[PDB]
Amino acid sequence: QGILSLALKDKAALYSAYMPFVKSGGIFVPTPKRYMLGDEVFLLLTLPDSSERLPVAGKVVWTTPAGANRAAGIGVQFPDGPEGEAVRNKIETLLAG
Amino acid sequence: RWVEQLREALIGDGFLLHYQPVLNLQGEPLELYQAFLRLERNGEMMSPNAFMAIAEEHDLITEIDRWVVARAIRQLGERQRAGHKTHLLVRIGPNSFSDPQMIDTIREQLAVYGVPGERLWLQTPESKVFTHLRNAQQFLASVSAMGCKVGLEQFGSGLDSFQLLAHFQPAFLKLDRSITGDIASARESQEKIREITSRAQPTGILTVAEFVADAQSMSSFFTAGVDYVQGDFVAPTGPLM
Ligand SMILES: Nc1nc2c(ncn2[C@@H]2O[C@@H]3COP(=O)(O)O[C@H]4[C@@H](O)[C@H](n5cnc6c(=O)[nH]c(N)nc65)O[C@@H]4COP(=O)(O)O[C@H]3[C@H]2O)c(=O)[nH]1
């Protein structure tokens, strides 16, 4: 419903959650709600480091139904620009180790 | 015989097209949609954004370009047999400016379905057109001879925009969002949109404002003289029609 929240607990969960083959980088967010492609959502992310929530205003570029695998959700591509490079960097420099 | 070609028909999922209706304002009424590429796969849907990077490094870019324009002409064909006369805006990468197979496809397809060229509107980013002026200029020439309309998207915020217009002389323009999001409150945008709007009309270049989400914006575009508008506030994107 516009405002989504995703908290990850460890490099592994972030590894399976972090989509890197996307443009500005992406993160898969589990939701049983019906989001359509292009949706501009606001995701409050929390990485394995600290419990600080990072603001991410992205677009829905991937939808899943959890059919006949992987929970059902949406893939949010990070905002083009500085604020995207920030979340994408924080993540890469985390999974790297 | 037929059998082997029939067995082929057992077609699965892959690329398909969704559409966004483009509405009237100052312009002439006409069934106009923008086609957006998509990829269906065992339940999931994908925006090109999620796969154009891998395409970019293997250069499927041009083939997926041709596939799109062809499916466009096709859809344009069915909508005619159904007696509709629909127009379609298709995004096209500069990679297709030099590609010959693109012209040939547009020509073949366009004839296959007996659809006039005026029904196909090819849009390309302004930024890419002057980095590739020549190839872009001959693509315009070739395509225009079949009757297709070519225009510039993301047009308006550069130091040499107005001079491209006089030079490239496109059929239409899709105003940059850097000018379109602001209009309800930005004086700079309100004037710039009018500046662009006044250089287009005398020649008949169609103006388009995309990603529109307000009533205010709608009203500001109308007055400024925009011919068409797209966005969530106007209409969603889907297979619809
Ligand atoms: N709810 C909502 N959603 C919005 C809004 N603004 C944009 N979006 C969504 O975000 C995506 C980005 O569109 P784009 O900026 O034109 O960026 C395009 C474009 O760069 C690329 N692309 C797709 N087809 C082609 C093509 O044939 N040629 C080229 N060169 N690029 C293409 O893929 C991207 C994806 O396009 P789409 O699939 O249509 O998915 C769109 C759209 O559904 C909004 O205000 N509200």
UniProtKB/TrEMBL annotation, chain A:
Molecular function per GO: cyclic-di-GMP binding
Q: Where's the PilZ domain?
A: 6-96
User: Could you tell me the superkingdom of the organism this chain comes from?
Assistant: Bacteria
Protein name, per record: Type IV fimbriae assembly protein
Q: Which organism is it from?
A: Xanthomonas campestris pv. campestris (strain ATCC 33913 / DSM 3586 / NCPPB 528 / LMG 568 / P 25)
Mapped onto the parent protein, the portion here is: 8 to 106 of 117
TrEMBL record, chain B:
Residue positions annotated to bind 3',3'-c-di-GMP 1 are 38
**Binding residue positions for 3',3'-c-di-GMP 2:** 37-38, 47, 65, 91, 210-211
Top-level division of the source organism's lineage:
Bacteria
Which residue numbers delimit the EAL domain? 1-241
Protein name from the UniProt record: PAS domain S-box protein
- Organism expressing this protein natively: Xanthomonas campestris pv. campestris (strain ATCC 33913 / DSM 3586 / NCPPB 528 / LMG 568 / P 25)
Which portion of the complete protein is shown here? 444 to 684 of 689
